[PDB]
Design a protein around this nucleic acid. Structure first.
Lengths: 48, 48, 292
RNA sequence: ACACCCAG
């Protein structure tokens, strides 16, 4: 159920859209969640 | 005022300065059968 | 969406929190879900819509403890930030336009129309070689004119680093490469600005805008720029009133040379009483005007 | 998010 090597994560699970939805706040402007901003930095560094 | 009888005690009565406060029952009354739900929690929203 | 009547549009009942069709009253779908924020924040600021859609990058804050600092007196994690060279150009131009507009105290709606004009031209990409400050300063000129309150080229050139010849060429090339038609200016549009800057009253303003409109309609001076007949209208309205203004102070606000304003005044003079309105309190007589 | 404020 829990191996020691499984705590050293090599793949990062991306949360679904139901966990980090984008809101509409006083007009047509999709404000992304903090996780979406943080997952953006994860992919950018991982691609780099 | 109802029966016209004298009240046995003697009421202390006189002019006193009173103020009406902004805390009004029509600004506070609130009810909800079923309404909008949150984007993230799918639970009822916060406040009237 | 309704089974029995799919054609009817669904009306929303936000108080009751459900989708109802207005013919048979059947509730279709599920409970409505608010797309707004649940609080009165876990979301960030939106991307600037006129700025091109780049990345959802974050920033790294200042260090808080000993684990945030390397042993040569510096932070281990640095705030490196990605941005396109195209977005750098748009940001540096938008930061120049707000600097340009607030020097002459333009409202924000002219700035937003300028940034709309700059983004539309920059993505269509016809102005390859001309400087970003020159094209931006020309877009500020057009957006001023498109709102019904145009400016002098010398007025815009006073703020920007860019010369009158260069912005003139940029103004010609933008209109040719955007297929945008803009109205021709008149003398009445340059009346409120040029009169309040010289500290002249409202009745003097009304006399100045009347003799300027009459001269254009009567067509007394072909081919003169509207600047030269506006400053001549100020010169008559100030010399024939209590608030006197010399040609130096009028020409300094107008950028018009103290030659050009005389050249304009030598032909608009001899029909002076026809131009003035019939209800003007003449503090100074018409025949007492100087023979300039 | 923050301020202000109601009740105990």
């Amino acid at each position: 159920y829990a191996r020691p090597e499984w705590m050293i994560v090599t793949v990062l699970p991306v949360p679904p859209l139901s966990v980090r939805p984008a809101v509409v706040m006083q007009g047509s402007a999709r404000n992304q969640d903090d996780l979406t901003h943080k997952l953006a930095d994860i992919v950018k560094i991982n691609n780099q | 005022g109802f029966t016209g009888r004298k009240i046995t005690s003697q009421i202390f009565i006189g002019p006193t300065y009173y103020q009406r406060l902004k805390h009004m029952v029509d600004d506070k009354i609130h009810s909800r059968a079923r309404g909008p739900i949150q984007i993230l929690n799918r639970q009822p929203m916060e406040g009237r | 969406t309704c089974p029995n009547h799919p054609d009817a549009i669904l009306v929303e009942d936000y108080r009751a929190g459900d989708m109802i069709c207005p013919e048979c009253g059947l509730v279709v779908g599920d409970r409505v879900i608010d797309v707004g924020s649940e609080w009165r924040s876990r979301v960030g600021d939106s991307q600037n819509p006129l700025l091109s859609d780049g990345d959802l990058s974050t920033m790294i804050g200042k260090g808080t403890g000993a684990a945030s600092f390397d042993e040569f007196g510096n932070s281990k994690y640095q705030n490196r930030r990605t941005m396109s060279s195209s977005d750098r150009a748009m940001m540096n131009a938008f930061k120049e336009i707000t600097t340009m507009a607030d020097r002459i105290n333009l409202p924000r709606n002219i700035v937003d129309r300028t940034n709309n004009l700059f983004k539309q031209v920059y993505e269509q990409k016809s102005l390859k070689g001309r400087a970003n400050d020159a094209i931006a300063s020309a877009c500020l000129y057009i957006a001023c004119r498109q709102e019904g309150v145009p400016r002098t080229f010398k007025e815009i050139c006073a703020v920007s680093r860019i010369s009158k010849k260069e912005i003139g060429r940029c103004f010609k090339l933008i209109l040719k490469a955007l297929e945008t038609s803009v109205d021709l200016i008149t003398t009445g549009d340059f009346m409120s600005r040029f009169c309040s800057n010289l500290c002249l009253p409202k009745q003097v303003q009304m006399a100045a805008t009347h003799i300027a409109r009459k001269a254009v309609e009567l067509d007394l001076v072909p081919g003169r720029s509207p600047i030269s007949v506006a400053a001549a209208a100020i010169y008559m309205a100030s010399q024939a009133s209590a608030e006197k203004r010399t040609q130096k102070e009028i020409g300094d606000i107008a950028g018009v040379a103290d030659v050009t304003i005389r050249q304009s005044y030598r032909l608009i003079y001899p029909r002076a009483p026809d131009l003035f309105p019939t209800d003007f309190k003449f503090d100074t007589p018409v025949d007492k005007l100087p023979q300039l």
